[PDB]
Paper text:
Based on these observations, enzymes involved in neurotransmitters breakdown (e.g., cholinesterases (ChEs); monoamine oxidases (MAOs)) are among the main biological targets for the development of new therapeutics. We then evaluated the compounds’ inhibition profile and binding mode towards cholinesterases (acetylcholinesterase (AChE, EC 3.1.1.7) and butyrylcholinesterase (BChE, EC 3.1.1.8)) and MAOs (MAO-A and MAO-B, EC 1.4.3.4), as well as their antioxidant and redox properties. To gain insight into the binding mode of TPP+ conjugates to hAChE and hBChE, attempts to solve the crystallographic structures of the complexes formed between compounds 2–5 and recombinant hChEs were conducted. Compounds 2–5 bind similarly to hAChE and compounds 3 and 5 bind similarly to hBChE, although distinct binding modes of compounds to hAChE and hBChE were observed.
For hAChE, the electron density map corresponding to compound 3 can be observed in the active site of the enzyme, identifying clearly the location of TPP+ moiety at the entrance of the active-site gorge of the enzyme (bottom left). Strong stacking interaction between aromatic amino acids located at the rim of the gorge of hAChE and the TPP+ moiety was not detected. The electron density map locates the benzodioxole moiety of compound 3 at the bottom of the gorge in a pseudo T-staking interaction with Trp86. Parts of the electron density of the linker between the TPP+ moiety and the benzodioxole ring of compound 3 are missing. Nevertheless, electron density is clearly present around the oxygen atom of the amide function interacting with Phe295. Indeed, compound 3 was the most potent hAChE inhibitor of the series (compound 3: hAChE = 2 µM), while compound 2 presented the lowest IC50 towards hBChE (compound 2: hAChE = 200 nM). While the TPP+ moiety was present at the entrance of the active-site gorge of hAChE, in hBChE it was located within the gorge in the vicinity of the active site.
Numbering used by the authors:
A (entry chain A): 5 to 258, 265 to 543
B (entry chain B): 4 to 543
The structure:
């Protein structure tokens, strides 16, 4: 029919009709938004895709940007769900739009999704990011895009013109510039676009909020289990150059301008293979090529930009899962596996602190064990397991997002905070991991509504409730419904009251304090300790 | 009216008094000279044994109180007047007292020795709440208490000097212990089973006695109530002791130095100044403005204390030792009204955060800025950082934990880990007669009333449940003195009081409710004070 042919500023498109229980929606998958960043364009800021003859086959997802794939638990759904589900390519700068089947007559608010995965992995084509349920249930249009990861997106020789850094973030900004120009052609309202992303995606949303040349491209922001001020999300210029030159040394690449020309000669698969070998210490929740504080894009460290900014006119929805740290322990913590119950020794715990909190002093590590061991049960392996799970999750996600939330609200933002604490009935991961990092996404996207997946019916109502909260936020800057006071109110997070809500099968329960007592240590005391020792 | 009231000790004849309790009478010998008066040239000098006397000594009334500051904070208030000296002040104060049961026991009976508290600057055995008669009547033990020099009179030191060597208040105590070694037999007491018990500075001194070998031959069991020798307030270094002493001499105008030595001339000038002028400038030698700090305390001099108590604790001779230790529930509250901004017994002391942050700087005086921030981290409720009610209770914890709770918790674990049999309690019943306000809970010093059986005095308006409580407590203590074990020799149903161990850390709760066995003596808080905080101070 004619609903599946739309033409944007660069050429004609041919979409696909997707089927949901609630009805059909129309999808345009794999839209080129940049000239392929190959050869001399590798490590370079993206260039806008020039117009094309003919019609683009936009019926299936395009390729995945080159990334390391996870072989810890081969064939296991818990890890394979996040692995690439299409061919790897450096020709990967494509985006996707979902829109309702009766194409909207009125301008509709748009959600744009930025996938996570520690700036080294991820793809928009993942099944857990399927847009159809969100646009069919709540009648918004949804855009997602691929951005370069690993060294291809975030290797930097700071100061150089040929490896400037943050081109994966510039990939994102370019796609946002694309929706301003082209989301109108699909029923989307350029004047109400909401960014939402999880993990490294959430941090990417944060950095767009701190980068003036992009803050004009969106109006609301959702940060799921991530913040740009996290200890893992940025590196200094000196460390970025230190990591880039050692990668070149590892692939036999003997100044800056010759260093980068050499790297463009290596096949992309050769760079990927040496990615994790450049890290300065053996560590958990650390990644080799992430955004760099260079003055371009990030005028200052994200913590500074957060501290002295004005956020009036901004609504932000942020939150964490209940067990942020558990997922990461099985990726390098001594004594941890998905297959046993991971009851660690005190010696394994004490060693786990040094790898969970890498590159801090001996005194700092003692401070961590002082705050996290139970001195009536210093040896109980279950308590040490839960303890190290907290250490990693708090230091890396909750305390970074709690710090961002307190300062945004205190400086003019309207902030709503959640803790997602429902364990999916479908969870392949063991039960000691609780609600792991990344396992709200399924519900936010309404995946329980897929008949092929056997989620319970109470779970399907949960996702419909959740995707309404999100849509509601995107439309209004408020998850609650305006003509519905009887429904339990989601109060704004504020620096003093620190109110958040709980997302599980029970109605909205309002709790106060986002692990306040622990994040006082990470956000307040610990920097003072490091600065004076 | 009998012959039980005429006893002869190694130095002469004594004349006692019959004392009255409801349950019966006891015979008491008060004001027994155990040392030659430390006057004139004897000021600041180690005590000398009382020379023997012709005739009979009148041992019928309490002797004098050692010269000390009197508390002028709340005149006429029972809460503060309770501890104030209730006899004439004099430097002639080295006298002791003995209580013994009527018909003095046929058998050798164990003896309890009491050492009073008051931060080494105050206190006397003459206080009403230290009246021995009730428990010596109730439990058939003999009880001894003694006066020791306090303030500069007991603990001024120029380390190395012959004329002010320090710890002479402790040497006063040691002299009294060897006195019972020679003479408690004359009263029915067994020199070979004597138990020391004391509160705060008393508790610290009994603790210090078991770390000084020449005192371990003088007792066999030890009770430490709300005090420990390793407390941050209980000892000073030689350098700080000389610094605090010389500054007192300058404050009362002692320049001269014509011949001899600088040290010996400095003290001779101090010997000439009246006692009350020294008392008046006592609190001015403190290095910073503080609560729970006292200027003249024992010094680590190499003699009495060969090393710091925390050192001496670690490598001690403690196997075969029974020790009973505990704290009240609100240790810090009493001390806040003596310098913490925003606090009064008459106010509800709802403090601001700005006042709290200033209060940690005075409760925890001797430390760096980074250390002080660490204290605010663990004790602030970051969900209600401004709530004045929580800030009030919070600062109470900082002072209570830092000064008594964590020091006795540290001493109890290390005694247990080296072979001692340690029993631990938490006293958490609030006397109905409480003079102090309600926010102070059970303050520092208000278990003493019950331990001594003051609820049984008809003059006082204690409740009926309180008098049975005191009888139970007086039994716990007596049992320990007799056996090294407070609970019943083989009670079938009364809940057993387990020994405190370094791993299980079991203690009991002392209130009208039966023995509650709890685990962990503020374990999570004292990890900061006993373990993390010293590393931080040594590393900044
Ligand atoms: O803690 C981490 C990071 C983990 C998370 C990834 C993730 C997953 C799903 C997500 C997501 C993020 O956000 C949204 O959803 N740690 C690194 C582990 C990542 C995978 C393999 C790397 P590691 C290695 C190298 C250097 C330092 C530390 C770790 C490895 C180590 C121990 C056990 C298993 C794997 C490796 C690299 C190259 C060859 C062999 C092994
Ligand atoms: C929990 O399991 C981990 C890993 O156990 C096994 O790893 C494979 C070798 C295989 O046997 C799987 O069935 C298990 O998952 C234990 O930690 C490992 O211990 C082995 C020694 O047996 C050592 O060689 C590895 O390096 C260890 N791995 C790590 C990451 O430390 C751990 O001890 C188990 N917990 C227990 C037993 O309480
Ligand atoms: C709580 O009380 C203290 C002092 O207790 C007394 O309370 C009053 C009835 C008044 O008569 C005071 O003079 C008493 O000492 C208060 O602390 C002092 O407050 C005054 C008033 O401005 C001030 O000048 C002093 O510096 C304060 N003392 C300090 C800071 O050490 C305190 O303010 C009272 N809190 C209240 C009433 O909320
Ligand atoms: C880096 O290394 C050498 C000199 O240190 C030099 O090759 C690079 O720039 C060169 O500039 C020359 C000017 O025309 C010319 O030889 C060529 O453009 C280029 N060389 C190349 C690409 O191999 C140096 N680059 C810097 C200093 O930025
Ligand atoms: C549940 O769904 C899985 C795939 O997600 C499928 O393999 C399985 O057969 C389903 N359950 C049943 C009982 O059929
Ligand atoms: Br244990
Ligand atoms: Br012994
Ligand atoms: Cl054409
Ligand atoms: Cl499996
Ligand atoms: Cl419409
Ligand atoms: Cl740009
Ligand atoms: Cl930062
Ligand atoms: Cl600031
Ligand atoms: Cl170090
Ligand atoms: Cl247990
Ligand atoms: Cl507002
Ligand atoms: Cl399981
Ligand atoms: Cl709550
Ligand atoms: Cl005489
Ligand atoms: Cl005679
Ligand atoms: Cl008898
Ligand atoms: Cl005292
Ligand atoms: Cl000296
Ligand atoms: Cl000094
Ligand atoms: Cl307590
Ligand atoms: Cl508050
Ligand atoms: Cl409240
Ligand atoms: Cl509470
Ligand atoms: Cl009152
Ligand atoms: Cl505690």
């Amino acid at each position: 029919d004619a609903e599946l042919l739309v033409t944007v500023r660069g050429g004609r498109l041919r979409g696909i009709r997707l089927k949901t229980p609630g009805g059909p929606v129309s999808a345009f998958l794999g839209i080129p938004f940049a000239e392929p960043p190959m050869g001399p364009r590798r490590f370079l800021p993206p260039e806008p895709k020039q117009p094309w003859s003919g019609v683009v086959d936009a019926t299936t997802f395009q390729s995945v940007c080159y990334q390391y794939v996870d072989t810890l638990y081969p064939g296991f759904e818990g890890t394979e769900m996040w692995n690439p589900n299409r061919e790897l390519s450096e020709d990967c700068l494509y985006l996707n739009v979902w829109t309702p089947y009766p194409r909207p007559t009125s301008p509709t608010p748009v959600l744009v999704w930025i996938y996570g995965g520690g700036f080294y992995s991820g793809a928009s084509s993942l099944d857990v990011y399927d847009g159809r349920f969100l646009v069919q249930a709540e009648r918004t249009v949804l855009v997602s895009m691929n951005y370069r990861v690993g060294a291809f997106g975030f290797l930097a020789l700071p100061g150089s013109r040929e490896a400037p850094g943050n081109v994966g973030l510039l990939d994102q900004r370019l796609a946002l510039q694309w929706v301003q120009e082209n989301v109108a052609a699909f029923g989307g309202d350029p004047t109400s676009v909401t960014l939402f992303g999880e993990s490294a995606g959430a941090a990417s949303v944060g950095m767009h909020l701190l980068s003036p040349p992009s803050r004009g491209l969106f109006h609301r922001a959702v940060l799921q289990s991530g913040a740009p001020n996290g200890p893992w999300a940025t590196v200094g210029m000196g460390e970025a150059r230190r990591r880039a030159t050692q990668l070149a040394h590892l692939v036999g690449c003997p100044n800056d301008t010759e260093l980068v020309a050499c790297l463009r000669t290596r096949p992309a698969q050769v760079l990927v293979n040496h990615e994790w070998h450049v890290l300065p210490q053996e560590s958990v929740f650390r990644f080799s090529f992430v955004p760099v504080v260079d003055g371009d894009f990030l005028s200052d460290t994200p913590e500074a930009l957060i501290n002295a900014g004005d956020f009036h006119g901004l609504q932000v929805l942020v939150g964490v899962v209940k067990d942020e740290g558990s997922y990461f322990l099985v990726y390098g913590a001594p004594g941890f596996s998905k297959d046993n119950e991971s009851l660690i020794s005190r010696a394994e715990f004490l060693a786990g602190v040094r790898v969970g909190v890498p590159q801090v002093s001996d005194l700092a590590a003692e401070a961590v064990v002082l705050h996290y061991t139970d001195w009536l049960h210093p040896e109980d392996p279950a308590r040490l397991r839960e303890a190290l799970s907290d250490v990693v999750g708090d230091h890396n996600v909750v305390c970074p997002v709690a710090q961002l939330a307190g300062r945004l609200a205190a400086q003019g933002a309207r902030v709503y905070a959640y803790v997602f604490e429902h364990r999916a009935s479908t969870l392949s991961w063991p039960l000691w991991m609780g609600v792991p990092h990344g396992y709200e996404i399924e519900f936010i996207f309404g995946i329980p509504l897929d008949p092929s997946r056997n989620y319970t019916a109470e779970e399907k109502i949960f996702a419909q409730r959740l995707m309404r909260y999100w849509a509601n936020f995107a439309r209004t800057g408020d998850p609650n419904e305006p003509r519905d006071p009887k429904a339990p109110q989601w109060p704004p997070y504020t620096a003093g009251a620190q109110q958040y809500v709980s997302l599980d099968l029970r109605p909205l329960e309002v709790r106060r304090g986002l692990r306040a007592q622990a994040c006082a240590f990470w956000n307040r005391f610990l920097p003072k300790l490091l600065s004076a020792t």
